[PDB]
Amino acid sequence: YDNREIVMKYIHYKLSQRGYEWSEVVHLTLRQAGDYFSRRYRRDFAEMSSQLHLTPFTARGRFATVVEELFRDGVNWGRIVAFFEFGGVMCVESVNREMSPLVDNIALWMTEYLNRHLHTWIQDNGGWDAFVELYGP
């Protein structure tokens, strides 16, 4: 599995579901799990998107501080889904705040963090295939 195209296809979906235009069960599983998670934490996500205050030279710091605080006490599948949902929120806010080019950079950050800081736990927990067996259709 290529973590890059997982990020690209998820980000493309999250932006297309908002009106912006930017091997498959994993993408559908991440889609369903992320949509349910964003619905369950709608108030927390509304407060998060309101207090983001995205600027070109603060987006990476806000992204990092939330990601490391999310994975500070370990990794699980739910925190990975929240990681994906958080990236989608940051891409939507980037498009929302006259900063569409930021989407590309965000996609490179997610890919990098997946390839360098989550690939070990994922492989040591059955990989993305185990993610689809547990919470996928």
Q: Contact residues for ligand 98I (CB under 6 A)? A: 32-33, 36-37, 41, 44-45, 48, 66, 70, 76-79, 81-82, 85-86, 135
Could you give the 3-state DSSP secondary structure of residue 47? helix
Dihedrals phi, psi of 136, to nearest 5 degrees:
-100, 170
CB of 113 to ligand 98I, least distance (A): 13
Residues 6+ apart with CB under 8 A from 36: none
CB of 61 to ligand 98I, least distance (A): 15
C-alpha–C-alpha distance, residues 47 and 58, integer Å: 18
Residues 6+ apart with CB under 8 A from 56: 99, 102
Select 44 or 104, whichever has its Cβ closest to ligand 98I.
44
CB of 94 to ligand 98I, least distance (A): 16
Select 101 or 129, whichever has its Cβ closest to ligand 98I.
129
